[model samples]
Target: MSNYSVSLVGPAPWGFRLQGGKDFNMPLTISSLKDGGKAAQANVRIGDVVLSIDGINAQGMTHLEAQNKIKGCTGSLNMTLQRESDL
Candidate 1:
């Protein structure tokens, strides 16, 4: 697993997006992120599996549930990712 940072504590969207989940029979993944977005600057790459978001497990979450989880984050989020190297 790998770790990444996303500072949503300051109320910024940071130009990134997530997709997939148990609903799709896939891990929560970083599906879209801008070239110079905060996420990219923080080393969040596309295809990075979102194992956790703000300490909440993402593996079994549905697509809508994942979005809910993300929307629930209100502080500096700690994201755990399952990177390609480990798979």
Candidate 2:
């Protein structure tokens, strides 16, 4: 239930610059956080498995769907993640 609030500012929109990977049928897990990106600034750590977007379950979304969901937000994006230690 670890959550991070990430804002979108500047010329770009709200994005965490989150990179993910998954084994078949498993949850998408954060593989990397680009340097100084929103996620990094928010302290979203690597290996955190995304559990939700804006309170919606992330397990049901495809990678692109999750990306679009975040992109569509007009303000900050909220994420729930499971840390590697919890997995």
Candidate 3:
């Protein structure tokens, strides 16, 4: 439930990196951003907790799963996130 919006259109030069536990409900955090990538260009910072992807809850998704979802985006991609400081 954070006030942020990020959109990526066309093919991405680099993708995001997620870090989380093996558990199903571990909240994945953005561990790294590709320099000059879509995410970095959009100002998405590291340590942003992924809330959802394209409106789908990402709370329990594994890194691979989330990456796959992002990869499946055809025309565009959207991600909702919560910053650690917001807590």
Candidate 4:
């Protein structure tokens, strides 16, 4: 994750937006998580809002879309994540 510096705490939750937004008028909701996250590791629900990542905003992304945005590869899918974070 290029923007690793921008992230919430490890025990943080995973959040997402439906169409697109990051405001109270556009509240976000969490989806699913792998096996590594404060909330995930702690066995949190999938519909919980993460609120933030490390210390940066992490809304406006569907879990699936966000997963694609965070996918890294050797060549073709080597796009640096704009709003990604690493443990």
Best by lDDT: 3
The reply for model 3, stretches above 4 Å from the true place, is 21-25, 85-87
In Å, residue 44's CA in model 2 sits off its true spot by 0.5
Per-model CA lDDT versus the true structure: 0.74, 0.65, 0.77, 0.36
* Better structure of 2 and 4 per lDDT: 2
lDDT by residue (5-82, candidate 2, tens digit) is: 444443344334445534246666676666777677666777777888888888767777777877776656677777
Arrange candidates by lDDT, descending: 3, 1, 2, 4
Score residue 7 of candidate 3 by CA lDDT.
Answer: 83
- Model 4 clash pairs? 7-53, 7-54, 7-55, 8-53, 8-54, 11-38
Identify the candidate with maximal TM-score: 3
Indicate the worst ten consecutive residues by lDDT in candidate 1: 1-10
Per-residue lDDT tens digits for candidate 3, residues 2-85, read 557788876754467888723645678888888888888887878888888899888888778888887888778888888763
Of the two candidates 1 and 2, the one with more favorable lDDT, higher being better, is: 1
lDDT, candidate 4, 2-81, per-residue tens: 22122333222332222233444443443445566443444344444444433334466455444444332112211112
lDDT of 1 by residue, 1-87 (tens): 456545444355766888788878988888898887667877777888888777778789998998887766665656778675344
Model 3's C-alpha root-mean-square deviation from the true structure amounts to 2.4
